[PDB]
Amino acid sequence: RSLKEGIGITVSDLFVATGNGGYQSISQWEATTFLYETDAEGTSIDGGRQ
Amino acid sequence: ITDGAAVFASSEFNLDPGQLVRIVSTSEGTFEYVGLTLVGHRQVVYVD
Secondary structure: OOOOOOOOOOOOOOOOOOOOOOOOOOHHHOOOEOOOOOOOOOOOOOOOEO | OEOOEOOOOOOOOOOOOOOOOOOOOOOOOOOOOOOOOOOOOOOOOOOO
């Protein structure tokens, strides 16, 4: 349950490996959601489904 | 305004129905005629 705290720069992530195998990418198979960060004075920063 | 020419400088800002737009000249000026035209963007809408 790797977890972010305090809105830090680092985003929550999970990389798991055994002694031999390499770490796997979890967010690579996730329903990720970004935002439409804009400098516009009229914000249209939507939560577009990444 | 300088030498009969002018430069625009400002950010954006939304205008809504009822709001009143005003312009004033800080300092006195003399001339024959001065024309100032702005530009806006409005969403096309049908009506009845």
